Amino acid sequence: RVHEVIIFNELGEICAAVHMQKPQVSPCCNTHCSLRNVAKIVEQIDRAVYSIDLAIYTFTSLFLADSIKRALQRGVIIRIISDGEMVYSKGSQISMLAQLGVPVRVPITTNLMHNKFCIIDGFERVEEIRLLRKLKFMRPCYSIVISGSVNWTALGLGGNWENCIITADDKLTATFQAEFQRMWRAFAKT
Amino acid sequence: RSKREKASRVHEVIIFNELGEICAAVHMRNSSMSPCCNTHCSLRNVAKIVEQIDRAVYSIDLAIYTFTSLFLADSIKRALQRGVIIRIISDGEMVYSKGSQISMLAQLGVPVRVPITTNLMHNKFCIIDGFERVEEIRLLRKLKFMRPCYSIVISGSVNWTALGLGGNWENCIITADDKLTATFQAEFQRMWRAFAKT
Ligand SMILES: [Zn+2]
Ligand SMILES: [Zn+2]
After folding, report:
1. Least buried of A78, A168, B117, B144, by fewest C-beta within 10 Å?
2. The CATH classification of domain A1-190, taken from the options 3.30.870.10, 1.10.260.40, 3.40.640.10, 3.40.50.720
3. E-assigned strands of A29-120?
4. Residues within 5 Å of ion ligand 1 by Cβ?
């Protein structure tokens, strides 16, 4: 199953001349290709069956916003937790997603919501959806978490030294999903 | 049963949140004469991080955006005194900040490298006794063996901040997972060679 660290660094665009539903990333020889890194994140979103719970500090990426928009159109249930200062700042894709009907919650606080992760089809959350829809069987799926230092922004995805882990590890995915459920109930609706 | 032993090694997510200090009074009462029942105890979270640093045998390679915590800096100094080789990669701007402990550690002889760019060095990971690094040290010291050790990586959104700059929602993973520790150690090695002193 999936289990790798995505590394962003200064070599991320040395293959720019080659690259010159998104992104569409033609093959290159650059191990550190930033476009490939973004594509790997999008691919996990493209694979979401039932739920995506996203806790993020800043989110401006068109490619990533588009992948979430497609998940909505497939019937995936999306919830977003963010920082109240950034959540509707200029360029925030969270504004756009809220307009489409995605629920958003933020803490009332002077501190920063800097806990950045996305849990796809978390077991606990898929089970909750199963109950709320009164179903007995679900289509096959498995939990995936994406988490690390990176924000879904121009600098985060196309400039900074950053990393994120993508993993199906049962213990990690379960812990992140649990903290999302806890934050969801504790935070303020927008 | 050897594999069970490996599986019992650290592999968990440390989460800081708004409940990190709800147990403050419990600790104070303890102190007047610590354990508490708070799952989210910020003091326990910090202890768990320092526990890994205190176990370092040979190397600590730290790639960090901002480092203002005195408590964590002291754990690094203790490791230095045990003979651990410490290296620091940081952000080119934040390394100049007043609260930064990097300057202090530099004065103790810790080498520091930063990128020469505008963009942020926004990694926040620490590799302890990384296989590729400990083997490098063995070879450089022309030794035929090393003491027992195993790799641990600490990484996430957590910055090593002074209490006065804390209270955020943040996480970090602490794991001995072979694939994860190897990948982080490899990027540290690469950045070390790529970057510049001061
Ligand atoms: Zn490329
Ligand atoms: Zn406590």
Report:
1. B144
2. 3.30.870.10
3. 51-55, 77-81, 104-106, 117-120
4. A 15, 28, 30, 33
Longest Cα–Cα distance of chain A, Å, equals 52
B155 bridge partner residues: B125, B173
| Catalytic residue ranges of B | 122, 124, 129
B180 contacts A5? CB cut-off 8 A: yes
Closest to B91 in 3D by CA, of B111, B64, B72, B69: B64
Specify the CATH class of B1-198 in words: alpha beta
Contact between A186 and B18 using a beta-carbon 8 Å cutoff:
yes
What are the sequence ranges of the domains in chain B?
1-198
Q: Give dist(CA A15, CA A37) in Å, integer.
A: 13
Query: Which has the closest alpha carbon to A63: A123, A113, A103, A19?
Result: A19
d(CA B2, CA A35): 41
Which residues neighbour B86 within 8 Å (Cβ) at sequence distance 6 or greater?
A: B59, B60, B61, B62, B76, B79, B80, B105, B110
Identify which of B18, B167, B179 has the shortest CB distance to residue A3.
B179
Taking the C-alpha atoms of residue B13 and residue B156, their distance in angstroms, rounded to an integer, is 9
Question: Closest Cα of chain B to A9: distance in Å?
Answer: 9
In this complex, how many residue pairs, one in chain A and one in chain B, have their CB atoms less than 8 Å apart? 100
Q: Which residues contact A186 (CB under 8 A, 6 or more apart)?
A: A107, B18
- Pick from B121, B167, B171: CB nearest A161: B121
- Reduced to 3 states (helix: H, G, I; strand: E, B; else coil), residue B73 is helix
Residues in A touching B125 (Cβ below 8 Å): 163
Q: How far is CA B48 from CA A11, B104, B159, in A?
A: 34, 24, 15
Going from the Cα of A171 to the center of ligand 2, the distance in angstroms, rounded, reads 23
Report CA Rg, chain A.
Answer: 16
